Design a protein around this ligand. Structure first.
Ligand SMILES: *[C@@H]1O[C@H](CO)[C@@H](O[C@@H]2O[C@H](CO)[C@@H](O[C@@H]3O[C@H](CO)[C@@H](O)[C@H](O)[C@@H]3O)[C@H](O)[C@H]2NC(C)=O)[C@H](O)[C@H]1NC(C)=O
Ligand SMILES: *[C@@H]1O[C@H](CO)[C@@H](O[C@@H]2O[C@H](CO)[C@@H](O)[C@H](O)[C@H]2NC(C)=O)[C@H](O)[C@H]1NC(C)=O
Ligand code: NAG
Ligand code: NAG
Ligand code: NAG
Ligand code: NAG
Ligand code: NAG
Ligand code: NAG
Lengths: 53, 108, 173, 173, 173
């Protein structure tokens, strides 16, 4: 569907948050966009390991 | 008697990566690079609306099919929307050559 | 514990302290407590800030239009544009996946390094005055107050202060 | 010997032992022999397993058809498809070559790190009881049997055991 | 000072000596001076030579022709060739920028490592004979001439030489 809302990049599965660098979502895009991959997830560590005892 | 020790942070967290030397590796803090999500909407760029064909073809838009609203006020826009299987092709058929080239010219 | 500490000589983490990723634990007569190392912690975190600004920004995202579409007398170009896009897609995918792996590895090593360096800083003062114990800690042959804690954090001890108390309380052992 | 051992303080390798990439050499009254460190060795090798599974698998190899061919009124597309393919080919080539270089560098560093950590583990027990010698080794001021070897491998010494024999046999020196 | 020295336990650099990137400073009765460590310096610099030969050469630069140009009934191919070239351009850009970042990081770490290793070499001789002081330096409980300097550079001390002078001049302290 179509809506009054605003964005900075767009694709059929939805309008897109242009904050972050990448999607794995859908290659077709218009705008100031991320970039596509074939992947599940990508997560940098800010912190480090968690062990209590 | 007294003692001094090192210290560092742990928490309750269980968010994880994959890594060269171990998998589902647990840490305290993380950051997802990815935008895995889509809002399920057709928003518009910037405050500039997109062009909507509704049911129409690009042929039905450009030529003046009366059930394609002409929309002369639409002077420039964010992007073009279609459906995949557009209803209103031409009411009198005919070969429409260089459909590709016109579309690329009307990319923008 | 690449460099020897975390799952190294140190075994496990501590959930008590949350104000910053590093610190000390003070144990003396007034009691016990945890207290974070904001100096090197904040320097490290500035490093991480510079990292992610230098990963995100290194892209340039055009005002892009991805899609094309074609008839069936263009199949040269169809299977091309497939091959093209899938090629590029896989390249960004592969580079980025390796990048997350490597950068996280070096990030763990960055943490490991900072804690080990600090372990050498703490050791650098209290060399003969006070001893290695077990793992993770040092025992004093003398006594230490909150002033001694705060001073020893910021790289100050005054070596002659409890020199002789160490020089004697060693000597039963 | 990036981190100080192999071509570092240690000079050269040993062909005697083959059951695993690390270990100790025991030297006591019953004789001499080599004995491998399966714990950290096996952990490391699990790391390498995870590496190569995480290098091979990160490709996705399609059911692919590479080739095309053209007439001579398509030379736009001929020199294109040349440029395209040669571009991609070179990119995979360059990334992969750097990848083998870097990953092997970090692999040497991974080995270096594990041995150095172990050197600190061995040192962590026997601190005042027994001394650094030369490079690569420690001499005891006491005596050690096969039980002492097997115990000292798995991170157990009982510090008071030969404490006093060390405290005396030091004192001629 | 990733590994503990440079902005680590060491604070700052020295502009006096220029013949080579590392060395020692000798301080004894004849006077003071700086003298460079050509052995490990030259080995390191051979490493850097091998680096840049292994960065430049890994390209292959064809006898290339970049450009094309087209009419306006080819706009498929125009926006293609734009997308193509800009794609490749960005990929080389991104890989190379990361490469300069990472390689320089590992280069600093390479330097850091070599100096720290040398600090352990210097320490490896003079263990009980002479003491850690402050940062960056060691004080002797004995006296050392230019022969002692040149010998101690090349990995030679003769431990029993000033053993007993250390064993006594310690003992006022
Ligand atoms: C715009 O698109 C609409 C939706 O497809 C077109 O209307 C539909 O056109 C089909 C054409 O086959 C109609 O079926 C035909 O109906 C007539 C009887 O009116 C019959 O003679 C044919 O044999 C066939 O069954 C369908 O009923 C019709 N539906 C609706 C709701 O209109 C429309 O013609 C298009 N208009 C233009 C200007 O492009
Ligand atoms: C787009 O096509 C759909 C066909 O599904 C049209 O739907 C019709 O809407 C009218 C009311 O406006 C109904 O009376 C019809 O029964 C609907 N038909 C179907 C099949 O649902 C829709 O109106 C078209 N929209 C435009 C803008 O042309
Ligand atoms: C877009 O993403 C940024 C960062 O993830 C976030 O701060 C913001 O709230 C997001 N907005 C929407 C509408 O998703
Ligand atoms: C862990 O702690 C954080 C902060 O208190 C909280 O947001 C999160 O829900 C907690 N999770 C669980 C499982 O307790
Ligand atoms: C992570 O993977 C290891 C692989 O053996 C497994 O032992 C562990 O349970 C896994 N943890 C989670 C949370 O999936
Ligand atoms: C270091 O700590 C002492 C007390 O612990 C304090 O008096 C002194 O001002 C501190 N110095 C710096 C540079 O923070
Ligand atoms: C360690 O070794 C000793 C003998 O050397 C043995 O008795 C003990 O069970 C071992 N412990 C473990 C945890 O392997
Ligand atoms: C080491 O230095 C000593 C004097 O300082 C010199 O006599 C000796 O030949 C040197 N050895 C080597 C291998 O350079």
């Amino acid at each position: 569907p179509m809506d009054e809302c605003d964005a900075k990049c767009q694709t059929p599965q939805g309008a897109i948050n242009s904050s972050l660098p990448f999607q794995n979502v859908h290659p077709v895009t218009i705008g100031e966009c991320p970039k596509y991959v074939r992947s599940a997830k990508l997560r940098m560590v800010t912190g480090l390991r968690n062990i209590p005892s | 008697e007294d003692t001094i020790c090192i210290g560092y942070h742990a928490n309750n967290s269980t968010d994880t990566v994959d890594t060269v030397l171990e998998k589902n590796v647990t840490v305290t803090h993380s950051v997802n690079l990815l935008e895995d999500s889509h809002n399920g909407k057709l928003c518009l760029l910037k405050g500039i609306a997109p062009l909507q064909l509704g049911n129409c073809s690009v042929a039905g838009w450009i030529l003046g099919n009366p059930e394609c609203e002409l929309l002369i006020s639409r002077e420039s826009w964010s992007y073009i929307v279609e459906k995949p299987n557009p209803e209103n092709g031409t009411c009198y058929p005919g070969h429409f050559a260089d459909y590709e080239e016109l579309r690329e010219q009307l990319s923008s | 514990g690449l460099f020897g500490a975390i799952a190294g000589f140190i075994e496990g983490g501590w959930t008590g302290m949350v104000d910053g990723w590093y610190g000390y634990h003070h144990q003396n007569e007034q009691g016990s407590g945890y207290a974070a190392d904001q100096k090197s912690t904040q320097n490290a975190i500035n490093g991480i800030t510079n990292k992610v600004n230098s990963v995100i920004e290194k892209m340039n995202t055009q005002f892009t239009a991805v899609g094309k579409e074609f008839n069936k007398l263009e199949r040269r170009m169809e299977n091309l544009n497939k091959k093209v896009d899938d090629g590029f897609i896989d390249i960004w995918t592969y580079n980025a996946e390796l990048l997350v792996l490597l950068e996280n590895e070096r990030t763990l090593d960055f943490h490991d390094s900072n804690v080990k360096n600090l372990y050498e800083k703490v050791k650098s003062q209290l060399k003969n005055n006070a001893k290695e114990i077990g793992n993770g800690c040092f025992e004093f042959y003398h006594k230490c107050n909150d002033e001694c804690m705060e001073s020893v954090k910021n790289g100050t001890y005054d070596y002659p202060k409890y020199s002789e108390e160490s020089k004697l309380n060693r000597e039963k052992i």
